[PDB]
Ligand binder design. Structure first.
Ligand code: NA
Ligand code: NA
Lengths: 402, 404
């Protein structure tokens, strides 16, 4: 096919061994309780014990459970060494890796300030990027950097590109587009191949897209609000990259891929305050209203109907033969979308699995799901991809494995 | 032309009356001096007098002068009517209550000033009003609206909130963020991509992409650091808000508009220069550093970059350059001169870029769009313009345009 772009070669990197969810819940409850006491000047022991009991009860009530997420990669969760009489014993790290310690449960419960967290994000994402691109043999024409969890100029992506001596590669930042960030990056990539075909640049044969989300860098243990307990137990870290080729180049290379058939994205009414993020003195501060599932449920089916129509497909006739890659924004989101679209389990199985084994890795989640489809599905399989994030924004893509 | 995109309809909005450079230098030196004393708990008068004398000397040596930049729009600098003076010190009157979020510095208590979240909340307010002014004449929603900034990152953004306020629920919004002073270039690049992606059929047909730049550099005032490159930054940058549209050429003709047709685009990093221009969000503002080496590094790479850029548009640098205008981002007081000299250009080929700088200062990513607006108004039809911008990376960005 001429005028066709194709996703391929998804490469994730794990930077830290995932932590079993029940351990994350025990230590996070403990930290929240310590922080609450520091923030409120509670220094007596019985007082701690009372607060700690209340805190555990709230986690038991609201936290994402180990039945919902089995484990999470949390680069900035304490090392199992060293987690140590009714408390936990968190060893100071060796000055040699102080940059992994951003929380403080002893002195200042606000923990590291935003500059310090950004310096750490650059060092951690820098190493993650070198690993993701270690098997890259030739520079891309473009490299797109997706993140909503650390904003530096120049970025760790620009520094990697310069480190590889790739002085003919355009670097574009695709930033602050939250959980759905893969969708604008693939649209920009499809746009770069199409701009080249129009002649505004010389020809191009590959765009790489690198996501580096360190949501654990934004831990906030000083705020006990329910939505913060939920976020602290829901989100996880994820680093993954993939390429977008013009289909003739994909073929010349003998590669299998997911051909882009259509894209869509826009805002949903009466929703802007329901999912927010603002940089503060210490971290990117997030809010996440419990109204969000209902608003997603309200608009998903119409959005999917239109998305299929843009692909030359018809929802009524074609949706039974489709897979649906659905971003698992919260524990029930895939189920809500599944119910509203009338989907069978086998249509949404990979999305549920990625969530269960990894938690919500922000924009890196849909790429992990697409990675699984590309590695498991038969050629000919068509996939409708749906994601939702701040705006609220609905984003969609229709793909066909080739 | 088929497969052709075209810039048009540049609309700036001025939010605050520009302040003459000399009073900004005086008040800013005073703020730096008061902040050094506050930071250090120095309360002695003579002690303050001595620091202030030292600070003024550093500004006389290093600050961008009124000969280099006549005035700047600075939303976060007080209006001249609120300044009190007389004894060599300054005081600032209380702002009108609905304008209190305009006060993000503190020279009486805690010289770090407003924290980063408070600054983002003020930026949301100012930019929200700016956007409403910028899009007040818009008669039909665009297919896409690209928000450009490097001076305030919120989710959802003021641009997405505007789009929802207007009921524009078929408009895709894309954030084109953290690409610094050259940020019009990736934005124009994404707009072109969106029109070409539509032609490929991955979306329905599109007729207009709007790009809205909102740069409030003055929200990032940092009077607590007296290092030289911060004296330069505090006196060089300025605020700028401006929107423009990218049309497929057939639509632009249907509308009867003049525009700048896009012929070619290029962008890539310069070697060994990542640490020469940096920004990092901290507790109170985006902290910037700017190396004195930037001009030499740009100068040493700009010719090969321009030759390649012209080649991408079908042109030959040595044969064709005398006929082109060159829009050059004025990143610092000597940048256009340096580029001008390396490329062997005549004053008249770079005059608008120097005038924009002299009249406005460096409005970050908004500066190139103001230059292009002037070429669109003033240039003869058929004039071709090579546009060059620099920013962190370092990154060199190029665009070749033709007025139609
Ligand atoms: Na760039
Ligand atoms: Na968006």
């Amino acid at each position: 096919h001429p005028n066709s772009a194709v996703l391929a070669d998804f490469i994730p990197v794990q930077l830290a061994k995932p932590v079993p969810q029940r351990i994350t819940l025990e230590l996070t409850a403990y930290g929240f309780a310590r922080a609450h006491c520091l923030s409120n000047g509670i220094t007596d022991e019985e007082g701690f014990v009372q607060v700690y009991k209340t805190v555990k009860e709230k986690f038991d009530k609201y936290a994402v459970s180990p039945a919902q997420i089995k484990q999470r990669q949390l680069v900035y969760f304490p090392k199992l060494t060293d987690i140590r009489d009714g408390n936990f014993d968190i060893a100071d790290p060796e000055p040699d890796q102080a940059h992994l310690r951003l929380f403080d449960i002893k002195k200042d419960p606000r923990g590291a300030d935003l500059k310090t967290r950004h310096e750490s994000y650059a060092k951690v994402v820098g190493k993650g990027l070198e690993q993701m691109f270690e098997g890259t043999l030739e520079a891309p024409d473009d490299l797109i950097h997706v993140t909503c969890s650390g904003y530096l100029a120049p970025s760790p992506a620009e520094r990697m590109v310069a480190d590889r001596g790739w002085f003919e590669t355009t670097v574009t930042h695709s930033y602050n587009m939250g959980c759905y960030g893969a969708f604008p990056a693939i649209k920009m990539a499809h746009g770069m191949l199409a701009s080249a075909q129009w002649g505004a640049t010389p020809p191009k044969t590959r765009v790489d897209i690198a996501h580096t989300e360190l949501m654990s860098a934004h831990n906030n243990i000083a705020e006990s609000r329910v939505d913060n307990i939920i976020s602290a137990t829901l989100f996880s870290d994820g680093l993954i990259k993939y390429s977008v080729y013009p289909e003739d180049e994909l073929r010349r290379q003998g590669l299998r891929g997911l051909r882009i058939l259509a894209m869509s994205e826009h805002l949903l009414p009466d929703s802007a305050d329901t999912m927010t993020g603002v940089p503060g003195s210490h971290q990117f501060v997030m809010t996440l209203s419990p109204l969000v599932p209902a608003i997603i449920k309200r608009h998903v089916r119409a959005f999917a109907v239109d998305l299929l129509r843009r692909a030359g497909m018809d929802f009524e006739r074609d949706k039974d033969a489709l897979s649906f890659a659905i971003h698992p924004g919260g524990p029930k989101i895939v189920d809500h979308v599944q119910e509203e679209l009338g989907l069978a389990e086998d249509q949404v199985a990979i999305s549920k699995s990625v969530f269960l084994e990894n938690g919500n890795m922000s924009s890196s989640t849909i790429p992990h799901i697409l990675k699984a489809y590309l590695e498991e599905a038969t050629v000919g399989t068509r996939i409708a991809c749906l994601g939702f994030g701040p705006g609220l924004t609905a984003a969609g893509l229709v793909l066909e494995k080739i």
